[PDB]
Design a protein around this ligand. Structure first.
Ligand code: CA
Lengths: 44, 87, 38
C-alpha cells in the first residue's frame, strides 16, 4: 500500500521533513557526494 | 631518388649540400660498450619518488595514530571528569 | 628491501584505514541511534 505521501510543509525545523540519502553504487559512507549522481531518497 | 631509404636520403642531401658531417670522426660504436645506463638513473628516480610515497603513507599513518590517541585521551578526560565531578 | 617496505607500509596503511572506518561507522551508528531515537 501507500502509507504516506509527499507534501510541502511551511516549517522546516520538524523531524518529518528530514530525508536520508542512499547511493546507487558502492560508495563509501564518509566520501563526498558527487555533484550529479543518481540517488535514492529514504524518509528518516 | 624513388627508392632511397632513410639514411640514403639523408646522405644524398648531405652530399648535394656539399657537406661531410655524416662521416664518423673519432667515434666508433664498438668503443662505446656502455649499454643503456639510464637504468641506474631510473632506479634513483624510482627510489626517490617511492620514498616520497613513503612520506605520504607514513604521514597518513602518523596522523591516524595521533587522532586515535586523541580520542583515547578525550575518553580519559571525560571519564575523569565524570568520576571526580560526580562523587 | 624498500619494495618490502612498500608491501609492509601498504598493509599497515590499509589496516589503519579499516580500523578508522570501523570507528567512523560506530560513530554513524551511535549518531543515528541518538538522533533517531530521542
Ligand atoms: Ca618511396
Amino acid at each position: 500500500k501507500m502509507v504516506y505521501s509527499l507534501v510541502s510543509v511551511p516549517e522546516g525545523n520538524d523531524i518529518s521533513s528530514i530525508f536520508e540519502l542512499d547511493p546507487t553504487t558502492l560508495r563509501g559512507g564518509d566520501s563526498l557526494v558527487p555533484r550529479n549522481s543518481y540517488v535514492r531518497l529514504r524518509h528518516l | 631518388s624513388t627508392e632511397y631509404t632513410g639514411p640514403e636520403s639523408y646522405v644524398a642531401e648531405m652530399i648535394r649540400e656539399r657537406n661531410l658531417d655524416w662521416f664518423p670522426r673519432m667515434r666508433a660504436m664498438s668503443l662505446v660498450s656502455s649499454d643503456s645506463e639510464g637504468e641506474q638513473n631510473e632506479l634513483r628516480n624510482l627510489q626517490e619518488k617511492l620514498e616520497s610515497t613513503m612520506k605520504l603513507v607514513t604521514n597518513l599513518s602518523g596522523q591516524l595514530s595521533e587522532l586515535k590517541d586523541q580520542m583515547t585521551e578525550q575518553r580519559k578526560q571525560k571519564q575523569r571528569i565524570g568520576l571526580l565531578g560526580h562523587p
